[PDB]
Symmetry: C3
Subunit: 330 residues, 3 copies
Amino acid sequence: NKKVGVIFRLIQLVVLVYVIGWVFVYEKGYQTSSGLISSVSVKLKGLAVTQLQGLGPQVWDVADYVFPAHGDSSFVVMTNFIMTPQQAQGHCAENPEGGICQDDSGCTPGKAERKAQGIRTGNCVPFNGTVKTCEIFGWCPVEVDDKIPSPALLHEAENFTLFIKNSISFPRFKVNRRNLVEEVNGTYMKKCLYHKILHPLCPVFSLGYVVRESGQDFRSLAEKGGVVGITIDWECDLDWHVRHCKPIYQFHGLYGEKNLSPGFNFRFARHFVQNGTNRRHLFKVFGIRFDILVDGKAGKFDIIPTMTTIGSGIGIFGVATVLCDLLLLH
Amino acid sequence: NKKVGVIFRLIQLVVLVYVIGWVFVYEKGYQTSSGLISSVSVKLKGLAVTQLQGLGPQVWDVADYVFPAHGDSSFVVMTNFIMTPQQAQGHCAENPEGGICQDDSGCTPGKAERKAQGIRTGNCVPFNGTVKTCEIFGWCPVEVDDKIPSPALLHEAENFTLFIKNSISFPRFKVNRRNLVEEVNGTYMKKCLYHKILHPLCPVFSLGYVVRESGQDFRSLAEKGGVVGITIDWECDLDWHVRHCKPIYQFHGLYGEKNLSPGFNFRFARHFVQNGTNRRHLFKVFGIRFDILVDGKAGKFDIIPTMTTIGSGIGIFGVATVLCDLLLLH
Amino acid sequence: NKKVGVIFRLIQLVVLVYVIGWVFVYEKGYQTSSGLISSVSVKLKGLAVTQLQGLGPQVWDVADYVFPAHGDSSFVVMTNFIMTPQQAQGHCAENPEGGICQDDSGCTPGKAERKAQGIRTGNCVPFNGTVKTCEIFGWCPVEVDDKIPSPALLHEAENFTLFIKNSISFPRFKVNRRNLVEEVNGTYMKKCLYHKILHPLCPVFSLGYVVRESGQDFRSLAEKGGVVGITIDWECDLDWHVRHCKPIYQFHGLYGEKNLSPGFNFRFARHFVQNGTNRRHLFKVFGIRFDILVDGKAGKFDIIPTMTTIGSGIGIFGVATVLCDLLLLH
Ligand SMILES: Nc1ncnc2c1ncn2[C@@H]1O[C@H](COP(=O)(O)OP(=O)(O)OP(=O)(O)O)[C@@H](O)[C@H]1O
Ligand SMILES: Nc1ncnc2c1ncn2[C@@H]1O[C@H](COP(=O)(O)OP(=O)(O)OP(=O)(O)O)[C@@H](O)[C@H]1O
Ligand SMILES: Nc1ncnc2c1ncn2[C@@H]1O[C@H](COP(=O)(O)OP(=O)(O)OP(=O)(O)O)[C@@H](O)[C@H]1O
Ligand SMILES: *[C@@H]1O[C@H](CO)[C@@H](O)[C@H](O)[C@H]1NC(C)=O
Ligand SMILES: *[C@@H]1O[C@H](CO)[C@@H](O)[C@H](O)[C@H]1NC(C)=O
Ligand SMILES: *[C@@H]1O[C@H](CO)[C@@H](O)[C@H](O)[C@H]1NC(C)=O
Ligand SMILES: *[C@@H]1O[C@H](CO)[C@@H](O)[C@H](O)[C@H]1NC(C)=O
Ligand SMILES: *[C@@H]1O[C@H](CO)[C@@H](O)[C@H](O)[C@H]1NC(C)=O
Ligand SMILES: *[C@@H]1O[C@H](CO)[C@@H](O)[C@H](O)[C@H]1NC(C)=O
Ligand SMILES: *[C@@H]1O[C@H](CO)[C@@H](O)[C@H](O)[C@H]1NC(C)=O
Ligand SMILES: *[C@@H]1O[C@H](CO)[C@@H](O)[C@H](O)[C@H]1NC(C)=O
Ligand SMILES: *[C@@H]1O[C@H](CO)[C@@H](O)[C@H](O)[C@H]1NC(C)=O
Ligand SMILES: [Ca+2]
Ligand SMILES: [Ca+2]
Ligand SMILES: [Mg+2]
Ligand SMILES: [Mg+2]
Ligand SMILES: [Mg+2]
């Protein structure tokens, strides 16, 4: 039948056009993918002043709210903290959430199995006017995290400037690229803010804009901390000029249930010596966690991948033809 | 022939059952796999008190033995250290391991090529009553690391509590998951310890339990140092409910030959100003290295992967039947 | 025809030799591959004395130029810094790059929108004899970055010794290997220096050698900063003995356009209490960024990969071999 032959030739032309176009153009068959070596260098620039009751104006600069100072990809930006200054290793009443005692016989000398707050001496001392806690030996007085100020202390850190410097290089092709491209110049970085449509190549990111693009409100996040994931994609074609290689930034919001362990927090201490007595300042920082992930590939024309793709296409063509013949003969 | 037809039908039925089951159900071909964005947040609640010979009791809390304060996945838990306090830059005898001099003419002014402890002045000063070392200009007193206490100073850190907060999200499917599952509640995290059979979902990990599950003794690993690798496999299936998706924790141990470079150690110093003189406290911490690596895949039904798997199965069936027929023909 | 059959037999034996040798040996089809768990431990031994103008001799050791104290794959080695001592919060003039004012009416009370150095009170104070800058509320004095010392301060850090301790383990094969191979002994590491041909197994890496092998000059990387990427490869075959497994160290140079943001730099502060007043020392460190990336796989004989390769070879032989029949027809 002529119609059977027409259908066979149509299927043959379809599969041939497919194997000659799709894998070659969309899948980049004539090209070869290769990994890159990425080193993330982040740099912020902003000032936040937090005024607390009983303490003077606290000045916080880039070195203060950015705890990883060596330029690590994973860094935390301080937004809310609880200040517990002038801690000494001495006897004090333990935190009330650890345990409540009504008499000295209730306390047991030793160390707590879970949430150890100090070396219990077996004495029940009054923590305050109402409740009493077992005396412990440790840094004192114990930090009380119970109260969380609803307004963020470092609320000025919402619209800060975040500069991410990423340099990637492909060892196979020996091509080194950086986030700073030929389109971006010195005067451009001085007056640009990152945007998905307006300024896609501007390396200066706004913290509030980054948090809002991920799908999270900055105020509720900074109130108790959080995690924001930033990804940089370096998908490009080496067949064109190096100016076409431009990094693409995607922001992903990492959030969980607020009923169980809401936000992200941690504690750090600054050890100093004053009046011959070693003292420290403990801060429970509720800050946003920023993680930079870089994943990209580069493809250039090569003989061996092209030949392998041609062979695979010829094989698929033959398989399709023999299968069509088998289906037609029934 | 009837037997040849029976054999061919058996072969085609076998390969059909194969392409139906093994490709779809076993390999999840109809589903679509994507990567996740992982962020690691770790917390340790526990106190360790170390009393040195001739020194007062020293209190070490979460801010002390956890050196990464921001909460990086790679963190070291202090278990044994050597304290050399009151170091100020000065001209003094070098460590005897660097060099031994019998007269002043042996020392040469300059800097050592390898393991340089200071700028040699060219004078041979007695380090102690027996041996003499060349005078250098560096921090003094030179830390002597030869004597490591067999009993671990922070031996109480074996049965501490480690909480790992892992939040992963898939961008293509827009699904966010956290290590805290619906099965785990607030009262469950109060009193639970992670176990391979009893409590697999309890986010509270015991350091000694993690070390013993990897195959290492905590005492020997703490007295000299070591590395423990923790991996979180987020096997997630979007076809079912999100409650069935669950994280799986695997504990691995990284160890080497004890004769060459036993354990893991590092050196850090705390700079302070006392009596108008810049002084520091150097510590050679022998701590266990913990690394968190999260890798997971999610699968959701989709039309295009299903069609591709059906086409691949049809092709495999066709090729197999043709091959079988060729073999039968012989 | 005889020649047609000869050509057919030749093509068949060629594709048979291909499917029996290439996928088996060149691709290691019978072997199975899996990921490893790697932890990077770096430790440097070197001392450099920087005699800054106006200050006494400053001694720098491993606890000084290595900013990651615990130890991470990404670490910075200090080569040049700008010291601003005795910083205290107060009301002082700002930098001229932020803003220049000729009268008190020019300054506006509030905080700068971009590159906010300090809270501007609103009064124009003379920064020096020539120019005047708006008075701010921040750390006093202000760091100046217009003058960069051309001679490297830590120029002695060029030929320091870098030791990398990497422990890899394959959970699929339960084999643990370390960079310290059996060929390397204790006395070997005392005098060896890493080289591409001379000492490939020596774990003592020279900083200048690493910088020069990547393709970058150490002088520019010390003056303005730089980034160097080091990759460790663990490609090995488990069919042989474990002594044949040797780590491969490759150095990559990550550089960008010197006209826009040359090198890598950061700022960190050391908080201390002197005379009852909180003070700090801010350093703009121009250091080289070293990133360690470990990627490797191990191969061991197994029955299932061998059977899959046999089936794939049979399939290819069937497909390719039946193919060209339309061509026999001519
Ligand atoms: N966080 C940021 N906010 C705004 N602009 C930035 C930020 N980081 C870098 N830039 C801009 O990028 C350019 C290149 O930065 P570079 O690496 O030279 O920093 P730098 O000039 O050494 O830092 P400093 O200005 O403290 O000396 C600078 O001109 C600067 O204006
Ligand atoms: N290392 C740990 N050991 C035991 N329990 C922990 C640990 N980390 C967290 N938890 C428990 O998990 C719950 C949620 O933790 P969350 O993130 O709220 O810490 P937190 O309450 O801010 O810390 P803190 O209790 O020190 O203020 C808490 O109720 C706490 O009891
Ligand atoms: N950065 C380095 N430069 C030169 N030699 C090193 C370096 N790191 C380690 N080594 C050598 O490797 C051997 C094993 O090192 P090990 O892990 O015992 O360090 P360590 O002796 O604890 O450190 P320290 O010498 O500071 O006490 C040592 O004999 C040392 O000479
Ligand atoms: C004493 O401390 C406890 C701790 O929970 C608190 O509930 C109580 O209100 C305090 N009492 C006073 C008078 O401050
Ligand atoms: C938002 O950005 C502006 C800069 O134009 C700044 O003045 C303002 O303080 C920012 N908002 C907050 C809440 O910090
Ligand atoms: C700076 O970069 C921008 C990119 O948006 C470009 O439009 C502009 O022309 C550049 N300026 C100069 C002076 O080249
Ligand atoms: C002096 O120091 C050396 C260092 O190796 C030691 O061997 C020796 O015993 C010491 N002598 C005394 C008397 O302490
Ligand atoms: C083991 O855990 C218990 C808690 O039940 C604790 O009291 C004990 O000190 C731990 N052991 C060590 C060696 O720390
Ligand atoms: C807490 O979680 C555990 C999970 O093991 C569950 O058995 C228990 O019922 C939960 N408690 C409440 C009050 O829901
Ligand atoms: C004052 O500071 C400015 C800062 O740019 C500088 O250019 C100028 O030379 C300085 N004047 C004197 C007299 O130091
Ligand atoms: C180069 O290495 C030698 C060691 O033989 C050392 O003496 C010299 O100071 C090094 N060069 C620099 C610039 O540090
Ligand atoms: C030390 O290791 C080197 C490796 O190059 C080897 O040649 C030498 O024989 C070893 N020394 C001893 C005493 O085994
Ligand atoms: Ca101090
Ligand atoms: Ca890291
Ligand atoms: Mg609490
Ligand atoms: Mg030693
Ligand atoms: Mg500047």
